[PDB]
Amino acid sequence: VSVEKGKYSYDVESLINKLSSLPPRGSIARCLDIFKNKLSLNDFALVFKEFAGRGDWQRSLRLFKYMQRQIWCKPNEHIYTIMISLLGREGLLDKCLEVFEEMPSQGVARSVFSYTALINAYGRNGRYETSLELLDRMKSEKISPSILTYNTVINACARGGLDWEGLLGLFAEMRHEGIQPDIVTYNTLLSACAIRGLGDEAEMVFRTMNDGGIVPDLTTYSHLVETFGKLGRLEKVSDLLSEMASGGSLPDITSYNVLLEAYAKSGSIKEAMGVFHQMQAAGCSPNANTYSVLLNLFGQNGRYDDVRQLFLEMKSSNTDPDAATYNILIDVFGEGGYFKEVVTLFHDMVEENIEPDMETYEGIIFACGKGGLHEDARKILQYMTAKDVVPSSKAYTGVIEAFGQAALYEEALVAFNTMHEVGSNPSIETFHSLLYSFARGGLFKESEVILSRLVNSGIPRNRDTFNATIEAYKQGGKFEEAVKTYVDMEKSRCDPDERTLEAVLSVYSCARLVDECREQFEEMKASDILPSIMCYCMMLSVYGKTESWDDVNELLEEMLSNRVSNIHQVIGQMIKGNYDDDSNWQIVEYVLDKLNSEGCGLGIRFYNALLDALWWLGQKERAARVLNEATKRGIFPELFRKNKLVWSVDVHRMSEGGMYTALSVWLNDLSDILVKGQDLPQLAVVVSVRGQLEKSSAARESPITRAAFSFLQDHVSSSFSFTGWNGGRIMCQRSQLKQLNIVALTNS
Amino acid sequence: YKSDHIRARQEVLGTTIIGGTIPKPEDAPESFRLLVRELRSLALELNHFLVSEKNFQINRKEV
Amino acid sequence: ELMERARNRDPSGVSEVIYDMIAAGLSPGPRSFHGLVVAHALNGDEQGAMHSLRKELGAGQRPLPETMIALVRLSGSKGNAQRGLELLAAMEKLNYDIRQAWLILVEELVRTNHLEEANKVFLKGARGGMRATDQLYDLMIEEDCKAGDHSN
Amino acid sequence: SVFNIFGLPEEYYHDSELSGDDSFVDGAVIAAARTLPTWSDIDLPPIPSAERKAVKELQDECRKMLAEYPTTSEQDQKLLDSLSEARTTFATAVKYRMHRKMFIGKIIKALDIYQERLL
């Protein structure tokens, strides 16, 4: 270790480096032979200052022994004080008293600062009794203690375990000496009361200094918050603030900031509003910190209406909110499912001329990704790139998952590729998002490519990788490879969650296996897990596959009541047709709106389950209306495309039941045209398979492709043929559209 | 650098033992600097200036 | 339809047509991505043009020389000399003649009053062995001497 | 770009790398590019529909020019092969007119493949 060049003098720096590089058995005097009559006492004082910070006390002690034997470099008071603190910090209490007792022998009278170093030396080792012996010795030695010397022994007793009555006795001793009291000891008085949970004593300390006309600092109120919070009497802090308000000592905002935050930790909403009204009556102007604390407290308890009103009041309070204040609203609105208001907040934020921060960027990007707002995420990404800001890995993961929600695989892959270009390396969350996005669409070739990427990256495979692979093979129709991967996961490690058993149940139900389905159903419900909508809908679907009307009825009998939850009751009543009325469908729409807050990832699976159940239970009209209300909600954004070029229906992310319902309503809408002279698209297509499988004959035998082809063939005859260039599309030219209510939708 | 360029004589001894190409001295040899000091002893100053053909900046050579 | 939308400075419509091609099974070739890049570049949108080039690369297609020269011209119009050099390096890596694009870049940099970056790119290309036209030589000499820059 | 002809108008040259084995691209294609009526608007892309009509009209012009000649190029080659008692200048003139006919035919084929590869 070499001293920084230019920090000290050349001769001083040379001495320190040579002493540092001197062997422990080397000659100290030989080094000092060159520096003899070159360095003053203060120069050696800086040498010991440099040695003390590094922690090499042995060389300092060795040099201090040699300096005693010489007259031209006799140590002074400053040198003695510096080395005493050096020895005490290392725990060498015995060596401290040795040098401290050398002052009478060395002809140096003891000073105040010498005792200050020694008090803290024994203070930091817990020997607070020794400090009081030294403190009393000054009184016998007629040495007037200083404030720092008094402060050192005061805090030494605090760490030593002295009684609280001792600290009060020490403080009263300070005031009687004629030295003006300072709030630092008052902080110590309030700290000890907070440490031992003393409320009445702490309030006495605050009252005592108030009558002295001394303005309290923030630390006094933070201690007051601590002591009353432990005893659960934070209301007395409000009484403390109110008393001084009429006494001429107006409380500051920072005092309220700790008090308001304390109620948030205690969850006291009605106390927080009372304090804010109490603060308003005091005439003080609220700051940014107050704005965020109330929003943080109100947001966590679900008062989304209150925060909107609160934000307008604070915006109209002639105070421009800060970026951190904006961020808190994004988190609650993002968690509350109000994604649109988050984006419109950015519209006003840029119009109010406040530059956002990385935290806000990640918050809005995560909100858009969870809510499937790909366009807003792309806009935010372009905006933050246009301002010379390098995006973080989390933001790129968020935009990737946002693009994957809307089946925009190409944009997600472009963003993933851009991640490496800017140096933002992918994380485990990015791989999880990619795997889920590819599994939703059934692109299992991309799934195995990503698995190979993970295995050559060395990252451990958690349950997310395994169940993403399971559902990717399930949607891709590879049931045998799906169960092979299931047993491979069971072989190694990790405990399957409810999602893994849900995926295996779905793949079993899809591949016409009632026995495994019922076995898994009776096994999983034995764990008292409140079986979800997915299992019930899958069971209804599989029972409708074999026309097990008795099983459907016996499930419905226990499904109708459902005393625990409301969603199951609503769906069970509506599937049977009890909620089809206009007044009886609003409960269903409200429960759907409530459910559309956990994410589009959950919403798509929930809609797949309910559509499969409705289609295979004879409720084709109900399936059509539920799909129609789901489309305008936001789920399945790629379902339909209408333009002069192509009319398309996308089913690669859907189940067999959902595909049939979508095809049923798509064929009907195609029959609506040809009744009017409003032209006709050049092409009508069905996107049965999307991904790498398109340029192969493997997608020809995919369950989605064959199911869609057979449905179209047995509904509209031999009009919808395959594509001679793509292996996963069903096409129909405009000429064959010219010759073309097609599907009968009825309730059983 | 075979007669009096003190800096360049020591570099030539080094490059030739490693075989790594000898560059131009570009500085004045000790015989010219010896002449300048003698002319200084007659109250005469002799300065060597380089005028850049790019930006016409006058550069004073160390001598 | 895609070229009609691209000539109308509507990159969003070009993306609509590309997604229609994807739905219909028609793989987007380099021509479609060239149209998208031109649509982005016509209305002075460098970030979107680079995003379109990234989409074309991720699609596995080999970009046309026209796309690359449009990108370098856009960078020169914006004065983004380093982006133009990166595009020239990419063009060289894809076995293309970068002389014409280099001329376009330096001429655009001169036109938009970016004489320092124009001189830098021109000297890079000249030391690289490329030869410029007589008009470009005269333009560089005359503009540099008018600016008082005798060194360049 | 379709035929990989690079450089300025006075230094058109086939790259011969991207073609790989396309013997079609030669000096005749360069001459066609130097003589065909062309338009350019910096970065304005061409609409394929107008290109089809333009190449059809140009092919009509080329076929009219070929019809203006009393004979064809293949029959000229056959005449050269069967020629046994003609001067050097006779065969030179025959080869000259045959080469002009070949150039026009090459223009026609180039327009066809250009309109084919425009998509």
Side-chain angles (χ1 to χ4, degrees), chain A residues 357-394:
Chain A
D357 197 305
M358 167 63 67
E359 185 181 347
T360 57
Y361 291 145
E362 169 54 36
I364 185 182
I365 285 185
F366 201 8
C368 295
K370 196 265 297 185
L373 275 305
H374 59 278
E375 173 189 345
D376 307 76
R378 138 155 47 90
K379 293 291 296 183
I380 296 303
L381 184 60
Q382 274 123 33
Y383 161 72
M384 67 181 300
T385 309
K387 303 304 171 299
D388 301 6
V389 174
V390 174
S392 56
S393 181
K394 44 182 177 57

CSV table of all heavy atoms in Angstrom, one decimal, chain A residues 357-394:
chain,number,residue,atom,x,y,z
A,357,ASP,N,-37.3,8.0,-14.7
A,357,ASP,CA,-36.2,7.3,-14.2
A,357,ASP,C,-36.2,5.8,-14.6
A,357,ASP,O,-37.2,5.3,-15.0
A,357,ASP,CB,-36.0,7.4,-12.6
A,357,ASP,CG,-34.7,7.1,-12.1
A,357,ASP,OD1,-34.2,6.0,-12.4
A,357,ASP,OD2,-34.1,8.0,-11.4
A,358,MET,N,-35.1,5.1,-14.4
A,358,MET,CA,-35.0,3.7,-14.7
A,358,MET,C,-36.0,2.9,-13.9
A,358,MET,O,-36.6,1.9,-14.4
A,358,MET,CB,-33.6,3.2,-14.4
A,358,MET,CG,-33.5,1.7,-14.4
A,358,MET,SD,-33.8,0.9,-15.9
A,358,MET,CE,-32.5,1.5,-16.9
A,359,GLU,N,-36.3,3.3,-12.7
A,359,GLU,CA,-37.3,2.6,-11.9
A,359,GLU,C,-38.7,2.7,-12.5
A,359,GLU,O,-39.4,1.7,-12.6
A,359,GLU,CB,-37.3,3.1,-10.4
A,359,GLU,CG,-38.2,2.4,-9.5
A,359,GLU,CD,-38.2,3.0,-8.1
A,359,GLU,OE1,-37.3,3.9,-7.8
A,359,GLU,OE2,-39.1,2.7,-7.3
A,360,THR,N,-39.0,3.9,-12.9
A,360,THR,CA,-40.3,4.1,-13.6
A,360,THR,C,-40.4,3.3,-14.9
A,360,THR,O,-41.4,2.8,-15.2
A,360,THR,CB,-40.6,5.6,-13.8
A,360,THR,OG1,-39.5,6.1,-14.6
A,360,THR,CG2,-40.7,6.3,-12.5
A,361,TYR,N,-39.3,3.3,-15.6
A,361,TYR,CA,-39.2,2.6,-16.9
A,361,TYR,C,-39.5,1.1,-16.6
A,361,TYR,O,-40.4,0.5,-17.3
A,361,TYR,CB,-37.9,2.7,-17.5
A,361,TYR,CG,-37.6,4.1,-18.1
A,361,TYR,CD1,-36.3,4.6,-18.0
A,361,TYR,CD2,-38.6,4.9,-18.7
A,361,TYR,CE1,-36.0,5.9,-18.5
A,361,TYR,CE2,-38.3,6.1,-19.2
A,361,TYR,CZ,-37.0,6.6,-19.1
A,361,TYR,OH,-36.7,7.9,-19.6
A,362,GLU,N,-38.8,0.5,-15.7
A,362,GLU,CA,-39.1,-0.9,-15.4
A,362,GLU,C,-40.5,-1.1,-14.9
A,362,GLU,O,-41.1,-2.1,-15.2
A,362,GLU,CB,-38.0,-1.4,-14.4
A,362,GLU,CG,-38.3,-2.8,-13.8
A,362,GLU,CD,-38.5,-3.8,-14.9
A,362,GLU,OE1,-37.9,-3.8,-15.9
A,362,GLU,OE2,-39.4,-4.7,-14.7
A,363,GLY,N,-41.0,-0.2,-14.0
A,363,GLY,CA,-42.3,-0.4,-13.5
A,363,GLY,C,-43.4,-0.4,-14.6
A,363,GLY,O,-44.2,-1.4,-14.7
A,364,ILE,N,-43.3,0.5,-15.5
A,364,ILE,CA,-44.3,0.6,-16.6
A,364,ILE,C,-44.1,-0.6,-17.6
A,364,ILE,O,-45.1,-1.2,-18.1
A,364,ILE,CB,-44.3,1.9,-17.3
A,364,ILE,CG1,-45.5,2.0,-18.3
A,364,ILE,CG2,-43.0,2.2,-18.0
A,364,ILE,CD1,-45.5,3.3,-19.1
A,365,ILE,N,-42.9,-1.0,-17.8
A,365,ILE,CA,-42.6,-2.1,-18.8
A,365,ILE,C,-43.1,-3.4,-18.2
A,365,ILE,O,-43.8,-4.2,-18.9
A,365,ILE,CB,-41.1,-2.1,-19.1
A,365,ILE,CG1,-40.8,-1.0,-20.1
A,365,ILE,CG2,-40.8,-3.5,-19.7
A,365,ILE,CD1,-39.4,-1.1,-20.6
A,366,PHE,N,-42.9,-3.6,-16.9
A,366,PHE,CA,-43.4,-4.8,-16.2
A,366,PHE,C,-45.0,-4.8,-16.2
A,366,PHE,O,-45.6,-5.8,-16.4
A,366,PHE,CB,-42.9,-4.9,-14.8
A,366,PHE,CG,-42.9,-6.3,-14.2
A,366,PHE,CD1,-43.3,-7.4,-15.0
A,366,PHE,CD2,-42.6,-6.5,-12.9
A,366,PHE,CE1,-43.3,-8.7,-14.5
A,366,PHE,CE2,-42.7,-7.8,-12.4
A,366,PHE,CZ,-43.0,-8.9,-13.2
A,367,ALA,N,-45.6,-3.6,-16.0
A,367,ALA,CA,-47.0,-3.6,-16.0
A,367,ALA,C,-47.6,-3.9,-17.4
A,367,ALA,O,-48.5,-4.7,-17.5
A,367,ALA,CB,-47.5,-2.2,-15.6
A,368,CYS,N,-47.0,-3.4,-18.4
A,368,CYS,CA,-47.4,-3.7,-19.8
A,368,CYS,C,-47.2,-5.1,-20.1
A,368,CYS,O,-48.1,-5.7,-20.8
A,368,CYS,CB,-46.7,-2.8,-20.8
A,368,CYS,SG,-47.1,-1.0,-20.6
A,369,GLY,N,-46.1,-5.7,-19.7
A,369,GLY,CA,-45.8,-7.1,-20.0
A,369,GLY,C,-46.8,-8.0,-19.3
A,369,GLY,O,-47.3,-9.0,-19.9
A,370,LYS,N,-47.1,-7.8,-18.0
A,370,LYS,CA,-48.0,-8.6,-17.3
A,370,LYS,C,-49.4,-8.4,-17.9
A,370,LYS,O,-50.2,-9.4,-18.1
A,370,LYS,CB,-48.0,-8.2,-15.8
A,370,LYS,CG,-48.7,-9.2,-14.9
A,370,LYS,CD,-50.2,-8.9,-14.7
A,370,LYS,CE,-50.3,-7.5,-13.9
A,370,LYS,NZ,-51.7,-7.2,-13.6
A,371,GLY,N,-49.8,-7.2,-18.3
A,371,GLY,CA,-51.1,-6.9,-18.9
A,371,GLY,C,-51.2,-7.2,-20.4
A,371,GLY,O,-52.3,-6.9,-21.0
A,372,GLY,N,-50.1,-7.6,-21.0
A,372,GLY,CA,-50.1,-7.8,-22.4
A,372,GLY,C,-50.3,-6.6,-23.3
A,372,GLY,O,-50.9,-6.6,-24.3
A,373,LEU,N,-49.7,-5.4,-22.8
A,373,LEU,CA,-49.7,-4.2,-23.6
A,373,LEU,C,-48.4,-4.1,-24.4
A,373,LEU,O,-47.5,-3.4,-24.0
A,373,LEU,CB,-50.0,-3.0,-22.7
A,373,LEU,CG,-51.4,-2.7,-22.3
A,373,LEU,CD1,-52.3,-2.5,-23.6
A,373,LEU,CD2,-52.1,-3.7,-21.4
A,374,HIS,N,-48.3,-4.8,-25.5
A,374,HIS,CA,-47.1,-4.8,-26.3
A,374,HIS,C,-46.8,-3.5,-26.9
A,374,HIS,O,-45.7,-3.0,-26.9
A,374,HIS,CB,-47.2,-5.9,-27.3
A,374,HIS,CG,-48.4,-5.7,-28.3
A,374,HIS,ND1,-49.6,-6.1,-28.0
A,374,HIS,CD2,-48.4,-5.2,-29.5
A,374,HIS,CE1,-50.4,-5.9,-29.0
A,374,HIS,NE2,-49.7,-5.3,-29.9
A,375,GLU,N,-47.9,-2.8,-27.4
A,375,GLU,CA,-47.7,-1.5,-28.1
A,375,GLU,C,-47.1,-0.5,-27.1
A,375,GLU,O,-46.2,0.3,-27.5
A,375,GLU,CB,-49.0,-1.0,-28.7
A,375,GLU,CG,-48.9,0.4,-29.3
A,375,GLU,CD,-50.3,0.9,-29.7
A,375,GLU,OE1,-51.3,0.1,-29.7
A,375,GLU,OE2,-50.4,2.1,-29.9
A,376,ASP,N,-47.7,-0.4,-25.9
A,376,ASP,CA,-47.2,0.6,-24.9
A,376,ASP,C,-45.8,0.3,-24.5
A,376,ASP,O,-44.9,1.2,-24.4
A,376,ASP,CB,-48.1,0.6,-23.7
A,376,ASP,CG,-49.6,0.9,-24.1
A,376,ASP,OD1,-50.2,-0.1,-24.6
A,376,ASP,OD2,-50.1,2.0,-24.0
A,377,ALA,N,-45.4,-1.0,-24.3
A,377,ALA,CA,-44.1,-1.4,-24.0
A,377,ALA,C,-43.1,-1.0,-25.1
A,377,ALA,O,-42.0,-0.5,-24.9
A,377,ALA,CB,-44.0,-2.9,-23.7
A,378,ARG,N,-43.5,-1.2,-26.4
A,378,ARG,CA,-42.6,-0.8,-27.5
A,378,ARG,C,-42.5,0.7,-27.6
A,378,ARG,O,-41.3,1.2,-27.8
A,378,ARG,CB,-43.2,-1.4,-28.8
A,378,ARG,CG,-43.2,-0.4,-30.0
A,378,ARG,CD,-43.2,-1.1,-31.3
A,378,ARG,NE,-44.2,-2.2,-31.4
A,378,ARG,CZ,-45.4,-2.0,-31.8
A,378,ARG,NH1,-45.8,-0.8,-32.2
A,378,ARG,NH2,-46.2,-3.1,-31.8
A,379,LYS,N,-43.5,1.5,-27.3
A,379,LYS,CA,-43.4,2.9,-27.3
A,379,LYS,C,-42.5,3.4,-26.2
A,379,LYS,O,-41.6,4.3,-26.5
A,379,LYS,CB,-44.8,3.5,-27.1
A,379,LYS,CG,-45.8,3.3,-28.3
A,379,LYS,CD,-45.3,4.1,-29.5
A,379,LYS,CE,-45.4,5.6,-29.3
A,379,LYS,NZ,-45.0,6.4,-30.5
A,380,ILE,N,-42.6,2.8,-25.0
A,380,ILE,CA,-41.7,3.2,-23.9
A,380,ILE,C,-40.3,2.8,-24.2
A,380,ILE,O,-39.3,3.6,-23.9
A,380,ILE,CB,-42.2,2.6,-22.6
A,380,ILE,CG1,-43.6,3.1,-22.2
A,380,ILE,CG2,-41.2,2.8,-21.5
A,380,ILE,CD1,-43.6,4.6,-22.1
A,381,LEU,N,-40.0,1.7,-24.8
A,381,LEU,CA,-38.7,1.3,-25.2
A,381,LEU,C,-38.1,2.2,-26.2
A,381,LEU,O,-36.9,2.6,-26.1
A,381,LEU,CB,-38.7,-0.2,-25.7
A,381,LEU,CG,-37.3,-0.7,-26.1
A,381,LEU,CD1,-36.5,-0.8,-24.8
A,381,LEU,CD2,-37.5,-2.1,-26.7
A,382,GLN,N,-38.9,2.6,-27.2
A,382,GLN,CA,-38.3,3.5,-28.2
A,382,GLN,C,-38.1,4.9,-27.6
A,382,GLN,O,-37.1,5.6,-27.9
A,382,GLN,CB,-39.3,3.7,-29.4
A,382,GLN,CG,-39.1,2.6,-30.5
A,382,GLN,CD,-40.4,1.8,-30.7
A,382,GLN,OE1,-41.5,2.3,-30.6
A,382,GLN,NE2,-40.2,0.5,-31.0
A,383,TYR,N,-39.0,5.4,-26.7
A,383,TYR,CA,-38.7,6.6,-26.0
A,383,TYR,C,-37.5,6.6,-25.2
A,383,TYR,O,-36.6,7.6,-25.3
A,383,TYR,CB,-39.9,7.0,-25.2
A,383,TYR,CG,-39.6,8.1,-24.1
A,383,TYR,CD1,-39.4,9.4,-24.5
A,383,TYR,CD2,-39.5,7.7,-22.8
A,383,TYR,CE1,-39.1,10.3,-23.5
A,383,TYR,CE2,-39.2,8.7,-21.8
A,383,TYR,CZ,-39.0,10.0,-22.2
A,383,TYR,OH,-38.7,10.9,-21.3
A,384,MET,N,-37.3,5.6,-24.4
A,384,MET,CA,-36.1,5.5,-23.6
A,384,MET,C,-34.8,5.3,-24.4
A,384,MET,O,-33.7,5.6,-23.9
A,384,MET,CB,-36.2,4.4,-22.5
A,384,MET,CG,-36.3,3.0,-23.0
A,384,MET,SD,-36.5,1.8,-21.7
A,384,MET,CE,-35.1,2.1,-20.7
A,385,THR,N,-34.9,4.7,-25.6
A,385,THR,CA,-33.8,4.5,-26.4
A,385,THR,C,-33.4,5.8,-27.1
A,385,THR,O,-32.3,6.1,-27.4
A,385,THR,CB,-34.0,3.4,-27.5
A,385,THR,OG1,-34.4,2.2,-26.8
A,385,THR,CG2,-32.7,3.1,-28.2
A,386,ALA,N,-34.4,6.7,-27.4
A,386,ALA,CA,-34.2,7.9,-28.1
A,386,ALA,C,-33.5,9.0,-27.2
A,386,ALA,O,-33.1,10.0,-27.7
A,386,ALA,CB,-35.6,8.5,-28.6
A,387,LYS,N,-33.4,8.7,-25.9
A,387,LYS,CA,-32.7,9.7,-25.0
A,387,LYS,C,-31.4,9.2,-24.5
A,387,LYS,O,-30.9,9.5,-23.4
A,387,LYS,CB,-33.6,9.9,-23.8
A,387,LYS,CG,-35.0,10.5,-24.2
A,387,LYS,CD,-34.9,11.7,-25.0
A,387,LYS,CE,-36.2,12.1,-25.6
A,387,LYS,NZ,-36.8,11.1,-26.5
A,388,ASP,N,-30.7,8.3,-25.3
A,388,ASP,CA,-29.3,7.8,-25.0
A,388,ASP,C,-29.3,7.1,-23.7
A,388,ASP,O,-28.3,7.3,-22.9
A,388,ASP,CB,-28.3,9.0,-25.1
A,388,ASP,CG,-28.3,9.7,-26.4
A,388,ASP,OD1,-29.1,9.3,-27.3
A,388,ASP,OD2,-27.4,10.5,-26.6
A,389,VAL,N,-30.3,6.3,-23.4
A,389,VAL,CA,-30.4,5.5,-22.2
A,389,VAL,C,-30.2,4.0,-22.6
A,389,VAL,O,-31.0,3.5,-23.4
A,389,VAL,CB,-31.7,5.7,-21.4
A,389,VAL,CG1,-31.7,4.8,-20.2
A,389,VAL,CG2,-31.7,7.2,-20.9
A,390,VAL,N,-29.2,3.4,-22.0
A,390,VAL,CA,-29.0,1.9,-22.3
A,390,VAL,C,-30.1,1.2,-21.4
A,390,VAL,O,-30.0,1.2,-20.2
A,390,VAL,CB,-27.6,1.5,-21.9
A,390,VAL,CG1,-27.5,0.0,-22.1
A,390,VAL,CG2,-26.6,2.2,-22.8
A,391,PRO,N,-31.0,0.4,-22.1
A,391,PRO,CA,-32.0,-0.3,-21.3
A,391,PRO,C,-31.4,-1.4,-20.5
A,391,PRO,O,-30.3,-2.0,-20.8
A,391,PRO,CB,-32.9,-0.9,-22.4
A,391,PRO,CG,-32.6,0.0,-23.6
A,391,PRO,CD,-31.2,0.3,-23.5
A,392,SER,N,-32.0,-1.7,-19.4
A,392,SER,CA,-31.6,-2.8,-18.5
A,392,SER,C,-32.1,-4.1,-18.9
A,392,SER,O,-33.0,-4.2,-19.8
A,392,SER,CB,-32.1,-2.5,-17.0
A,392,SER,OG,-33.5,-2.3,-17.0
A,393,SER,N,-31.6,-5.2,-18.3
A,393,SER,CA,-32.0,-6.5,-18.7
A,393,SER,C,-33.5,-6.7,-18.3
A,393,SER,O,-34.2,-7.4,-19.0
A,393,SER,CB,-31.1,-7.6,-18.0
A,393,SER,OG,-31.5,-8.9,-18.4
A,394,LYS,N,-33.9,-6.2,-17.2
A,394,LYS,CA,-35.3,-6.4,-16.7
A,394,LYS,C,-36.3,-5.7,-17.7
A,394,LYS,O,-37.3,-6.3,-18.0
A,394,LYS,CB,-35.4,-5.9,-15.3
A,394,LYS,CG,-34.8,-4.5,-15.1
A,394,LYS,CD,-34.9,-4.1,-13.6
A,394,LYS,CE,-34.2,-2.7,-13.4
A,394,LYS,NZ,-34.7,-1.7,-14.3
